[PDB]
Amino acid sequence: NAMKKTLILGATPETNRYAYLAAERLKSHGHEFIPVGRKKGEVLGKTIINERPVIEGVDTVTLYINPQNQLSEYNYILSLKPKRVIFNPGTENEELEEILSENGIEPVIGCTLVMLSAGTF
């Protein structure tokens, strides 16, 4: 499948964390990744964006923040108007899924890593 501009929400420099693993797989697959979150640092050469700039052309938001922490991000996710939002394990949030799909954004429950391997990313 095609290259997709992918924003990682919950990006972290900690190499054992799934948001880091995702950046590595996205990158090695050739997707442009954009690291956004509250943690300070750099992920594979990119400063993690600690503000919330409205970046144009995001295809996929891939979520690595827990449902409690998502509350403060709903309107930001909406303002990005992505084609798809991925709920990785432990981020599932039925309210946010409905709000997305209501607004014509496809919620997808799966693991970004599995999806890249399976060919369904």
PDB file of C-alpha atoms in Angstrom:
ATOM      1  CA  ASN A   1       0.000   0.000   0.000  1.00  0.00           C
ATOM      2  CA  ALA A   2       0.795   3.770  -0.240  1.00  0.00           C
ATOM      3  CA  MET A   3       2.921   6.057   1.904  1.00  0.00           C
ATOM      4  CA  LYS A   4       0.740   7.754   4.500  1.00  0.00           C
ATOM      5  CA  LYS A   5       1.617  10.845   6.485  1.00  0.00           C
ATOM      6  CA  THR A   6       1.217   9.571  10.041  1.00  0.00           C
ATOM      7  CA  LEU A   7       1.029  11.643  13.222  1.00  0.00           C
ATOM      8  CA  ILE A   8       2.005   9.766  16.444  1.00  0.00           C
ATOM      9  CA  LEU A   9       0.120  11.216  19.363  1.00  0.00           C
ATOM     10  CA  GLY A  10       1.834  10.235  22.595  1.00  0.00           C
ATOM     11  CA  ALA A  11       5.322  10.176  20.984  1.00  0.00           C
ATOM     12  CA  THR A  12       8.175   9.315  23.420  1.00  0.00           C
ATOM     13  CA  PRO A  13      11.965   8.935  23.141  1.00  0.00           C
ATOM     14  CA  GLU A  14      11.865   5.822  25.428  1.00  0.00           C
ATOM     15  CA  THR A  15      12.921   3.037  23.032  1.00  0.00           C
ATOM     16  CA  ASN A  16      10.948   0.287  24.798  1.00  0.00           C
ATOM     17  CA  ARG A  17       7.647   2.132  24.404  1.00  0.00           C
ATOM     18  CA  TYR A  18       5.214   1.242  21.630  1.00  0.00           C
ATOM     19  CA  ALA A  19       5.042   4.848  20.309  1.00  0.00           C
ATOM     20  CA  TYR A  20       8.785   4.578  19.697  1.00  0.00           C
ATOM     21  CA  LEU A  21       8.473   1.130  18.158  1.00  0.00           C
ATOM     22  CA  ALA A  22       5.771   2.586  15.840  1.00  0.00           C
ATOM     23  CA  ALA A  23       8.000   5.450  14.658  1.00  0.00           C
ATOM     24  CA  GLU A  24      10.711   2.888  13.814  1.00  0.00           C
ATOM     25  CA  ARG A  25       8.351   0.663  11.802  1.00  0.00           C
ATOM     26  CA  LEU A  26       6.654   3.628  10.049  1.00  0.00           C
ATOM     27  CA  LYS A  27      10.031   5.050   9.179  1.00  0.00           C
ATOM     28  CA  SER A  28      11.457   1.766   7.874  1.00  0.00           C
ATOM     29  CA  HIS A  29       8.313   1.374   5.777  1.00  0.00           C
ATOM     30  CA  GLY A  30       8.859   4.851   4.273  1.00  0.00           C
ATOM     31  CA  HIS A  31       5.931   6.712   5.830  1.00  0.00           C
ATOM     32  CA  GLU A  32       6.528  10.269   7.049  1.00  0.00           C
ATOM     33  CA  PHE A  33       5.954  10.182  10.842  1.00  0.00           C
ATOM     34  CA  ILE A  34       5.281  13.242  12.989  1.00  0.00           C
ATOM     35  CA  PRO A  35       5.945  12.949  16.776  1.00  0.00           C
ATOM     36  CA  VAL A  36       3.516  14.898  18.986  1.00  0.00           C
ATOM     37  CA  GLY A  37       3.018  14.617  22.734  1.00  0.00           C
ATOM     38  CA  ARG A  38       3.901  15.989  26.143  1.00  0.00           C
ATOM     39  CA  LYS A  39       7.284  14.243  26.597  1.00  0.00           C
ATOM     40  CA  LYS A  40      10.432  16.256  25.815  1.00  0.00           C
ATOM     41  CA  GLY A  41      12.992  14.824  23.401  1.00  0.00           C
ATOM     42  CA  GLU A  42      13.732  13.530  19.895  1.00  0.00           C
ATOM     43  CA  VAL A  43      12.423  10.445  18.084  1.00  0.00           C
ATOM     44  CA  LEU A  44      14.701   9.245  15.284  1.00  0.00           C
ATOM     45  CA  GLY A  45      16.000  12.755  14.636  1.00  0.00           C
ATOM     46  CA  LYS A  46      12.731  14.698  15.016  1.00  0.00           C
ATOM     47  CA  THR A  47      12.019  16.974  17.952  1.00  0.00           C
ATOM     48  CA  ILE A  48       8.786  15.849  19.633  1.00  0.00           C
ATOM     49  CA  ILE A  49       6.255  18.646  19.117  1.00  0.00           C
ATOM     50  CA  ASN A  50       4.997  19.715  22.531  1.00  0.00           C
ATOM     51  CA  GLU A  51       2.479  22.241  21.239  1.00  0.00           C
ATOM     52  CA  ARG A  52      -0.477  21.347  19.043  1.00  0.00           C
ATOM     53  CA  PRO A  53       0.134  22.878  15.577  1.00  0.00           C
ATOM     54  CA  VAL A  54      -2.628  22.066  13.043  1.00  0.00           C
ATOM     55  CA  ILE A  55      -0.555  20.176  10.480  1.00  0.00           C
ATOM     56  CA  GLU A  56      -2.043  19.807   7.011  1.00  0.00           C
ATOM     57  CA  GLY A  57      -2.333  16.552   5.061  1.00  0.00           C
ATOM     58  CA  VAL A  58      -2.242  14.040   7.963  1.00  0.00           C
ATOM     59  CA  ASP A  59      -3.593  10.700   6.684  1.00  0.00           C
ATOM     60  CA  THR A  60      -3.512   8.773   9.954  1.00  0.00           C
ATOM     61  CA  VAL A  61      -3.334   9.762  13.602  1.00  0.00           C
ATOM     62  CA  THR A  62      -1.899   6.795  15.551  1.00  0.00           C
ATOM     63  CA  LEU A  63      -2.763   6.990  19.233  1.00  0.00           C
ATOM     64  CA  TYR A  64      -0.479   6.121  22.120  1.00  0.00           C
ATOM     65  CA  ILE A  65      -2.231   8.071  24.906  1.00  0.00           C
ATOM     66  CA  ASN A  66      -4.677   6.519  27.325  1.00  0.00           C
ATOM     67  CA  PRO A  67      -8.410   7.337  27.071  1.00  0.00           C
ATOM     68  CA  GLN A  68      -8.266   9.716  30.077  1.00  0.00           C
ATOM     69  CA  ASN A  69      -5.511  11.777  28.367  1.00  0.00           C
ATOM     70  CA  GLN A  70      -7.388  11.724  25.043  1.00  0.00           C
ATOM     71  CA  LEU A  71     -10.141  13.997  26.407  1.00  0.00           C
ATOM     72  CA  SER A  72      -7.925  17.085  26.100  1.00  0.00           C
ATOM     73  CA  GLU A  73      -7.056  16.060  22.477  1.00  0.00           C
ATOM     74  CA  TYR A  74     -10.507  15.410  20.870  1.00  0.00           C
ATOM     75  CA  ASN A  75     -10.809  18.827  19.216  1.00  0.00           C
ATOM     76  CA  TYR A  76      -7.171  18.732  18.073  1.00  0.00           C
ATOM     77  CA  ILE A  77      -7.653  15.339  16.431  1.00  0.00           C
ATOM     78  CA  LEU A  78     -10.827  16.694  14.728  1.00  0.00           C
ATOM     79  CA  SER A  79      -9.022  19.876  13.552  1.00  0.00           C
ATOM     80  CA  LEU A  80      -6.425  17.656  11.832  1.00  0.00           C
ATOM     81  CA  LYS A  81      -9.244  16.101   9.743  1.00  0.00           C
ATOM     82  CA  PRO A  82      -7.265  12.860   9.273  1.00  0.00           C
ATOM     83  CA  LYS A  83      -8.641  10.050   7.080  1.00  0.00           C
ATOM     84  CA  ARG A  84      -8.127   7.551   9.896  1.00  0.00           C
ATOM     85  CA  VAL A  85      -7.365   7.324  13.595  1.00  0.00           C
ATOM     86  CA  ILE A  86      -5.748   4.098  14.935  1.00  0.00           C
ATOM     87  CA  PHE A  87      -6.568   2.944  18.513  1.00  0.00           C
ATOM     88  CA  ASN A  88      -3.515   0.835  19.497  1.00  0.00           C
ATOM     89  CA  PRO A  89      -3.849  -1.617  22.428  1.00  0.00           C
ATOM     90  CA  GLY A  90      -5.079   0.047  25.592  1.00  0.00           C
ATOM     91  CA  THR A  91      -6.146   3.279  23.864  1.00  0.00           C
ATOM     92  CA  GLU A  92      -9.636   2.043  22.867  1.00  0.00           C
ATOM     93  CA  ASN A  93     -12.238   4.718  23.547  1.00  0.00           C
ATOM     94  CA  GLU A  94     -15.788   4.139  22.356  1.00  0.00           C
ATOM     95  CA  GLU A  95     -16.891   7.762  22.811  1.00  0.00           C
ATOM     96  CA  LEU A  96     -13.964   9.010  20.721  1.00  0.00           C
ATOM     97  CA  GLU A  97     -14.578   6.347  18.031  1.00  0.00           C
ATOM     98  CA  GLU A  98     -18.198   7.583  17.645  1.00  0.00           C
ATOM     99  CA  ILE A  99     -17.225  11.241  17.627  1.00  0.00           C
ATOM    100  CA  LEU A 100     -14.687  10.480  14.883  1.00  0.00           C
ATOM    101  CA  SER A 101     -16.969   8.334  12.734  1.00  0.00           C
ATOM    102  CA  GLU A 102     -19.760  10.971  13.210  1.00  0.00           C
ATOM    103  CA  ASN A 103     -17.384  13.523  11.799  1.00  0.00           C
ATOM    104  CA  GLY A 104     -16.473  11.256   8.835  1.00  0.00           C
ATOM    105  CA  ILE A 105     -13.133  10.068  10.338  1.00  0.00           C
ATOM    106  CA  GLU A 106     -12.582   6.297  10.324  1.00  0.00           C
ATOM    107  CA  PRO A 107     -11.775   4.856  13.750  1.00  0.00           C
ATOM    108  CA  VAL A 108      -9.682   1.632  13.441  1.00  0.00           C
ATOM    109  CA  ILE A 109      -8.902  -0.677  16.372  1.00  0.00           C
ATOM    110  CA  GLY A 110      -5.587  -2.508  15.800  1.00  0.00           C
ATOM    111  CA  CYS A 111      -1.836  -2.440  16.485  1.00  0.00           C
ATOM    112  CA  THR A 112       0.140  -0.178  14.161  1.00  0.00           C
ATOM    113  CA  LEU A 113       3.032  -2.708  14.192  1.00  0.00           C
ATOM    114  CA  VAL A 114       0.783  -5.680  13.294  1.00  0.00           C
ATOM    115  CA  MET A 115      -0.908  -3.608  10.610  1.00  0.00           C
ATOM    116  CA  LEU A 116       2.375  -2.656   8.957  1.00  0.00           C
ATOM    117  CA  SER A 117       3.446  -6.313   8.951  1.00  0.00           C
ATOM    118  CA  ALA A 118       0.061  -7.657   7.885  1.00  0.00           C
ATOM    119  CA  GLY A 119      -0.089  -5.227   4.958  1.00  0.00           C
ATOM    120  CA  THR A 120      -3.205  -3.526   6.286  1.00  0.00           C
ATOM    121  CA  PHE A 121      -1.641  -0.200   7.316  1.00  0.00           C
TER     122      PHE A 121
END
